[PDB]
Amino acid sequence: DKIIHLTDDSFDTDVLKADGAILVDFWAEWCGPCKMIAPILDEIADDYQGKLTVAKLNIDQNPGTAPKYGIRGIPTLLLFKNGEVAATKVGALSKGQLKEFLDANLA
């Protein structure tokens, strides 16, 4: 498993202190589009090994963090660069859509 399973307590260390790119997924279990991008995120974790880390924060189990980033709709994917959000994607997307988004914003 290449994915970081975040908590509200671990966010600072896992995301804000990490030396590189973290793709954070803000999601919930009852959220249909959230569950659709889940296996895509697994594949991307594999594909982007050494370029970025994928991390997931479930917003019901960890209610404190989303509001700090003004998250309303889910899924919301935030690409962090050394603790600094670089890019925002709200809603579901295919692997092809995520690849382009990542390639364009990792540059």
Range of the domain at 17: 1-107
- The CA distance from 80 to 28, in Å, is 20
Q: Are 71 and 52 in contact (CB under 8 A)?
A: no
CATH number of the CATH domain containing 2: 3.40.30.10
Query: Phi first, then psi: what are they for 101, rounded to 5°?
Result: -60, -45
**Residue 57 contacts by C-beta under 8 Å, 6 or more apart in sequence?**
6, 7, 11, 24, 25, 26, 27, 65, 66
Say what the resolution is, in angstroms. Answer: 2.4
- The CA distance from 85 to 5, in Å, is 19
Method: X-ray
Active site residues: 31, 34
Q: Are 102 and 79 in contact (CB under 8 A)?
A: yes
> What does the block give as tokens for 41?
């995120």
Query: Phi first, then psi: what are they for 84, rounded to 5°?
Result: -120, 115
Structural domain tally of the chain? 1
